[PDB]
Amino acid sequence: TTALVCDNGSGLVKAGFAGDDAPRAVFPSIVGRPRHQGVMVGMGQKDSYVGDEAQSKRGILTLKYPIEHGIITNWDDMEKIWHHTFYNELRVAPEEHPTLLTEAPLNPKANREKMTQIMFETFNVPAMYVAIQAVLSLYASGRTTGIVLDSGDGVTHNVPIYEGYALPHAIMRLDLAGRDLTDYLMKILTERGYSFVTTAEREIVRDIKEKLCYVALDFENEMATAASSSSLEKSYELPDGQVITIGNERFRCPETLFQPSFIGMESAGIHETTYNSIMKCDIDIRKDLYANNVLSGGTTMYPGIADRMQKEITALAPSTMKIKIIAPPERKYSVWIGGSILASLSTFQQMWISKQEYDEAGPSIVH
Amino acid sequence: TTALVCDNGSGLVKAGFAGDDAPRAVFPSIVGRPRHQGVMVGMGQKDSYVGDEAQSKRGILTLKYPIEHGIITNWDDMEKIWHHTFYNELRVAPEEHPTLLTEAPLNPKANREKMTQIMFETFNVPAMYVAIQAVLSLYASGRTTGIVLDSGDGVTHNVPIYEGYALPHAIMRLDLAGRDLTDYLMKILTERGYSFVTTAEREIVRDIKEKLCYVALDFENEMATAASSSSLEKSYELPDGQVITIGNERFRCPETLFQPSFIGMESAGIHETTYNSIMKCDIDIRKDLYANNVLSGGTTMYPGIADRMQKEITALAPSTMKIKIIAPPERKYSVWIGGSILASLSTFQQMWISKQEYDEAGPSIVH
Amino acid sequence: TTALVCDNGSGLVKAGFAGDDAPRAVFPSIVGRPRHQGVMVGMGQKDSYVGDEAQSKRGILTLKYPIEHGIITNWDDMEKIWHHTFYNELRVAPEEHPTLLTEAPLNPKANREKMTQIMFETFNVPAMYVAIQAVLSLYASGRTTGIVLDSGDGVTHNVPIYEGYALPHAIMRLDLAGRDLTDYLMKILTERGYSFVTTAEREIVRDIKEKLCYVALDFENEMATAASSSSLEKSYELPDGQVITIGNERFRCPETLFQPSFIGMESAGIHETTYNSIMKCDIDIRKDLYANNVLSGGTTMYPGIADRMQKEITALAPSTMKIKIIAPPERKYSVWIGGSILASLSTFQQMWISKQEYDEAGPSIVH
Amino acid sequence: TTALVCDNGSGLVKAGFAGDDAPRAVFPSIVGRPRHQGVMVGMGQKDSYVGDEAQSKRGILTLKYPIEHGIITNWDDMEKIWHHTFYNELRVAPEEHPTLLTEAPLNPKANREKMTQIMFETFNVPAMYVAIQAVLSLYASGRTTGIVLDSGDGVTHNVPIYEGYALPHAIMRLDLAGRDLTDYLMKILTERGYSFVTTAEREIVRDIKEKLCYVALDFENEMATAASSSSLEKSYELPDGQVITIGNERFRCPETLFQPSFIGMESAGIHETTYNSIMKCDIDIRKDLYANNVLSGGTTMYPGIADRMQKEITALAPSTMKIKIIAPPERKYSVWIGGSILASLSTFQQMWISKQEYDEAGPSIVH
Amino acid sequence: TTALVCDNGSGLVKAGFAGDDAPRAVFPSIVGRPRHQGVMVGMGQKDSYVGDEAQSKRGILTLKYPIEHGIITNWDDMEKIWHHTFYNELRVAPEEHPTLLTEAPLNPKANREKMTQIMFETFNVPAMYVAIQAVLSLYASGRTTGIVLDSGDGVTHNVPIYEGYALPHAIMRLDLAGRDLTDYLMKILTERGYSFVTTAEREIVRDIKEKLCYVALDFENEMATAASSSSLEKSYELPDGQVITIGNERFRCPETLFQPSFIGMESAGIHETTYNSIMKCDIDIRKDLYANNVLSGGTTMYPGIADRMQKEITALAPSTMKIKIIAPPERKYSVWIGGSILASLSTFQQMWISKQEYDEAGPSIVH
Ligand SMILES: Nc1ncnc2c1ncn2[C@@H]1O[C@H](COP(=O)(O)OP(=O)(O)O)[C@@H](O)[C@H]1O
Ligand SMILES: Nc1ncnc2c1ncn2[C@@H]1O[C@H](COP(=O)(O)OP(=O)(O)O)[C@@H](O)[C@H]1O
Ligand SMILES: Nc1ncnc2c1ncn2[C@@H]1O[C@H](COP(=O)(O)OP(=O)(O)O)[C@@H](O)[C@H]1O
Ligand SMILES: Nc1ncnc2c1ncn2[C@@H]1O[C@H](COP(=O)(O)OP(=O)(O)O)[C@@H](O)[C@H]1O
Ligand SMILES: Nc1ncnc2c1ncn2[C@@H]1O[C@H](COP(=O)(O)OP(=O)(O)O)[C@@H](O)[C@H]1O
Numbered sequence A, B, C, D, E: 001t002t003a004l005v006c007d008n009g010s011g012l013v014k015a016g017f018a019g020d021d022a023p024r025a026v027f028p029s030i031v032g033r034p035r036h037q038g039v040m041v042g043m044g045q046k047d048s049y050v051g052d053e054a055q056s057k058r059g060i061l062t063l064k065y066p067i068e069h070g071i072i073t074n075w076d077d078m079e080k081i082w083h084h085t086f087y088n089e090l091r092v093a094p095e096e097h098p099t100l101l102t103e104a105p106l107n108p109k110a111n112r113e114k115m116t117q118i119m120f121e122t123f124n125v126p127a128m129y130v131a132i133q134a135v136l137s138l139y140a141s142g143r144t145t146g147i148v149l150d151s152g153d154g155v156t157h158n159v160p161i162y163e164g165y166a167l168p169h170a171i172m173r174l175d176l177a178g179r180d181l182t183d184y185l186m187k188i189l190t191e192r193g194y195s196f197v198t199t200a201e202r203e204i205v206r207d208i209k210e211k212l213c214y215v216a217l218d219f220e221n222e223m224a225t226a227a228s229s230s231s232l233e234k235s236y237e238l239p240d241g242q243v244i245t246i247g248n249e250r251f252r253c254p255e256t257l258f259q260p261s262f263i264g265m266e267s268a269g270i271h272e273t274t275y276n277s278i279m280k281c282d283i284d285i286r287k288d289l290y291a292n293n294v295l296s297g298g299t300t301m302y303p304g305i306a307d308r309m310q311k312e313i314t315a316l317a318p319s320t321m322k323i324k325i326i327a328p329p330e331r332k333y334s335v336w337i338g339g340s341i342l343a344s345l346s347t348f349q350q351m352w353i354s355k356q357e358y359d360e361a362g363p364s365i366v367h
């Protein structure tokens, strides 16, 4: 009897059986709702739209994200994406295999006591377990020392590790992820005659950022030479029938992760939060984090991120020891791959929450 | 020497000398072109039309708006309304007094680099300056801290400001203003036998909206009682020789600004965009924006707006603090009045773009 | 001519003339710097704010403490709070009255060699004098023998004294005061859906701790019964209008001073550091420290601190002698009150550092 | 059949077979205990570490010395360093070779009756023997006349000898050794902006004292010239990467052994205790202790100790004779070398405590 | 006009007017000196303390005995205790009453020519006289025949006398008194985990010997039952609060007087000096020294001395006579009581040294 590893995170859904290598069920966490009525005769009059079906009719349906920066805002729409996975894509009954959920660290207590209630009352699950994304994304490389820089779509977290001894005090959250970049891209794209404000067109410009947009080496270097368009522009085709050509808006959009001054927050960037959290730790464990930094998530995919971490961090940190960053390919599933092999060990089975240990004790035992 | 304050925006044109209190030249941005020929002993000929002369001959001529939602569409018609202004109404040469232009915030770059070229190559202006309508409309009241709700004719902008230090990140534009309301009134009036398709009759129904049509307190409470037309109906004298009598189509037209669910967009109303931008600001400055909101523009003189904003915002925002809306009379000319007094200060003369500076720099120092 | 009693400590500033009973000019040690770049004419200006004016603009201005844990980190901003006080609030010329500064005990030599240089080269002061906190905080009670437990905001010090003869070897510093509590509260507050990361909201949650939060009698007794919402919760009125209600986060935040395991340091709590310093002294002077302990500072203000010192200390010490703790009201200003009466005696005027003496000896006669 | 020469002194452990010249098993007397509670699967485990493994994980493992100033404070942790050595470093069964322990002189009776019990009940040792570190470190040179100055890590002992005849009246213990110098270094290093309070950093600054710090020739000589530091400063490389440069803190830290007035103690230094004990002995044996003084231990390793003993002692003692001090290299391991050669003779084999004799007599025949 | 009887003995000072019964001026011979450097204003000052005030501040003041084993070591501290008595305790001018001093017998010419110089040059004493503590302590009982055993604090002297005639060849001094017992108690107390080295704690353990410690009947009859502590132990209450309980360390400390083998000196015990001195006298006076032995001093109030002198002396002396020891109460003040009644006679008044006689003869008439 295998286990079910599901990652209920913002952006995409990574669910599948344990012990595998790649999940066979991927779909964005969207809830489609009909806007107007029906201009033709002979269509589906249903209201609940879950899965990849809403992506084909974005101009007609209304998309909405149920999870907002990790914190579960809406609850009646969160159950829709959980029942459709176990009866359409996976096609497995939850009463036969345990479900291993995954939640972001530093999560408010208003979501942990309600997430286990859905997986017990509604969905009859024999045993469940939740943990921190930094641990599940650590087994993907086979190491137990370093710092995990998780940046998916909710909140960017920086949780280090030292031979299995976690440090909850070094958990410094940062509201700079994938959803925070598409918001700044909307206001910076309308300066060329491309007016957009409709929610249906928010995911159209997001696909352009995942390929064309990247992280440049310097900020005040490519901007002075951006007036002469020679290699920083490329024509993109839309399914509606328009031509979109960007110029200097390709490298300045991912700069928000490094420069929080674009949104208007006095917090530190992704290159400074990974260094300030190390200062709060012990001096003896401040030598195995610079050359052992691991960056995972779905947002950290711009061709040029690993080449920038060896400059801004090296300038702040004293240049004496060695600094090396590892960036393995296909890091979007670092939580699902590392979490599937975690349930294969024999020592992990002694941590599942029993059905009789919840209704007789209370939700205060999952913490 | 005095200055020239001209607000070249969609809808109407406000021009005049600086230091005054009311402009003396107002005319809509229309380009009259003869469509059908008409032989008559007396009239003839004059090909192109510009100014308030085309308003007297609408059934023969054809009007066209050169500016569309702030974005400058065509350019051969934008110069006609500028040369016919300083040599007919103002009767002053631009080579003697500086021209102070005004543009809408979050404007595309295709209009800033081209507007300064016309005011430098064609019209020999010694110095020019552009800014944001939210700042110029703030000097008309005589305050410092206060979010400006400018709703002219194209795009409604909400740019808050807390004691001089503005916040460009809280600029949330909305495509719901003046021109966006007369389009929905045409498709809703055809059900009562009053249908029009000619562009000449588009401004006839606009004058009816500026007087009879207003904003009510509630929407769903007036629809159930709309069957017994006793006080919500009034006959209108059509210049051609007809009687226009509307009933329930009086308060539902301005409701589009509050409920965008009538046209076909997933955007929010005018009372939600002014509240969502406050959430993005700091909590320390979220206590001087509800009781200090200032509304300006052309799409505001509806008798019944100040009494409605005190209820929709109160239903969403907590009722712990106090909410007070200020609406001074003659709020339509707040851009021209505030722009004339701004040039009277001695510290403002050090911000004009010199002619010798643009020839050495180029289209880059305007921003 | 009287003397100037100033306290250049972290948190708040206590300045005023000598011989008084309460300071007439208090302001936090914050520096105001603009975040964004507002576009106005005749605003401000004030590039670097100083004083209590930044409390009204905490969101716009970037708050930053120039002094960190007693050690003067930044120097160009430390002079701003020294010139703004002697020419706005006090309005006294430094060339007429001697300035009596106050520094924390066990400070680096880099601060004593630079603080006196500013009070000699820039600010022309005829005579100055520096001392440690446990001396000035002792004259406020009118006693001689008694260990002083000073806990202001940066570093908590425990400097005992037996009849004037101080003991520098028994000085045990602890980085657990006022600044270390608001940092742990920032991480424990986000567990209920209240996310805060901006520096502007660091002082907002600090005022809640100064009234609602207190030190309880036990730790595991009130927490086990905190599952039921009874009298352990109270709603606070934020300046914005939101409703914030905490549960068990009222007594667990002040517990960090007693249990340093919350942050992640192997140091001892405030109740154990005061006991280990007595062990390093002679046995004859180990009987006049438990019944004569004095606790001062700005942090020691929780209603329940004096009731706890008679239990944890009594349990460790042999239950035979008497342990009495004295805590007079208004113990925060005890450093400024004790320093004003110290400069009133005739035997204190023969200890000031002469202006001509420092220029002929150097910074080595300061100690 | 050889014997096992082990040293249970504080600081380091010197174990090995008898008849050799250098021990092959050295490790600090530290216990590794977990601090935080990590959430990992398959970590460690090892709840209690022992050996040199804790030196690589000092930031997490809480360092704690089981022996304090010779007196065994903790007993459950003292057995950990004994069983780990006989099965990992030495890899020899205690049932085949006798174990020769070494204890400090003037040891309390509560330790001799307990240390011998562990080697009989838990471990199965055929015969054991305890004595005094002064006589054991005397045979390392080849003489049996003079005074042995043993300064290991906790308590410095000065026990003379005169042809086998011991003098217990001249035994004057002093709490000034290796552990007493690193405590004063913790408070004297923070005077330059380098704050330290964590127990893990106690061994980091200890390595600097064992190499850079030394004993100068005079106290009031190198301090007056500390303003123009031309050769008393040197940059040290930390494992983290920070740069720490000390000035006058290089010679003033080891001065505590000569001037006990630094830590608030009015006792005599290492140069005065060795002179007062001689005056308490006979008169004819006064010419065999000045020119025959032997210094041993781990603390007496600073390059400059032998050059200072010829000035302070000669100034006090009459200069009518000769005072020669012997300091052979590798004097730290003199206790283990002298303990192995002593068990090689035939007169020492008849002094071991038989296992069957301890059961018939009791814990009273050990003294 | 009466006389002043002052005793300059080590340990305590017995001064008062002649003709009384108990002295009213008693204080230890200690000189309080500041150890640390307190940074306070209005403390002390008193650079040199003298009297019973130093007993309340032992943990700060440095204790030092000006007289060592009778021989005056430091003369600058000896004058301090002489001037403090005549102006605080006695409150009598030395120019009105003669001062009667008393020195120790058998002096190597060091306390005769220098002791009288202070009472003549500095102090203005009309007449003074010095003698021997043995004869002066004999008049307290009313007899003129018998050996006097004066065991105070420095050196125990045994000078017999047979009706006025004093044999100088029978004077046998022994360095075993009160100060010689508290030194052996320091090294014998640390064998139970109670370490002491501070000079302030030397008087704390001395007070325990004056009550709990006493002279037992034998020696080997109590060491066999010392392992089972049933009635030979008692918990002592320290002024700090610690619990110190000794076992066999109660009667073994006073045994050093009888058995000097615990130190290492070649001299015999106190019961051999009283027997060997009789053999050096005449043969006819051998029947008046065993039954007329008088023991006095400070080292005699041990409950268990009269029961021991009748066993060791009787076993050595021939059992063909009568042996009886007399021990009147308050034997410690026998020197001051016997010295005051001696000055009341008309014969002793003609033996004083006149002020005009010492200046004309010299320091040679003191003997
Ligand atoms: N190649 C890419 N380049 C840039 N951004 C990407 C790329 N791929 C995905 N993203 C961003 O990642 C987000 C989705 O993250 P997701 O995979 O859901 O994180 P997680 O796996 O932790 O749930 C999207 O909003 C998208 O903007
Ligand atoms: N009294 C009124 N009531 C309602 N709407 C009005 C009124 N006056 C003008 N408007 C609207 O304002 C629009 C013109 O705005 P305009 O004055 O050009 O704005 P701005 O002054 O900012 O350029 C017109 O489309 C018209 O519908
Ligand atoms: N009533 C209170 N309860 C708890 N903490 C307080 C209270 N008043 C002040 N503090 C803490 O004291 C700190 C300020 O200390 P301060 O008065 O500057 O010390 P000092 O007077 O020694 O400079 C603040 O950070 C605040 O958190
Ligand atoms: N090279 C050195 N210079 C100065 N001090 C040293 C040196 N090596 C060791 N020490 C001191 O010796 C102490 C350890 O003594 P240790 O070798 O354990 O004594 P023992 O061998 O008698 O157990 C440490 O506290 C350290 O301060
Ligand atoms: N009750 C007592 N029992 C035992 N020893 C005592 C007692 N009282 C005093 N002593 C000892 O006597 C010493 C003081 O002697 P002191 O009275 O000064 O002699 P003197 O009177 O000859 O100067 C102290 O060191 C103390 O140890």
Ligand SMILES: [Mg+2]
Pocket (backbone or CB within 6 Å): A009, A133, A150, A151, A152, A297, A298, A335
């Ligand atoms: Mg993730």
Ligand SMILES: [Mg+2]
Pocket (backbone or CB within 6 Å): B009, B133, B150, B151, B152, B153, B297, B298, B335
């Ligand atoms: Mg406008």
Ligand SMILES: [Mg+2]
Pocket (backbone or CB within 6 Å): C009, C133, C150, C151, C152, C297, C298, C335
């Ligand atoms: Mg203070």
Ligand SMILES: [Mg+2]
Pocket (backbone or CB within 6 Å): D009, D133, D150, D151, D152, D153, D297, D298, D335
């Ligand atoms: Mg040793």
Ligand SMILES: [Mg+2]
Pocket (backbone or CB within 6 Å): E009, E133, E150, E151, E152, E153, E296, E297, E298, E335
């Ligand atoms: Mg005496």
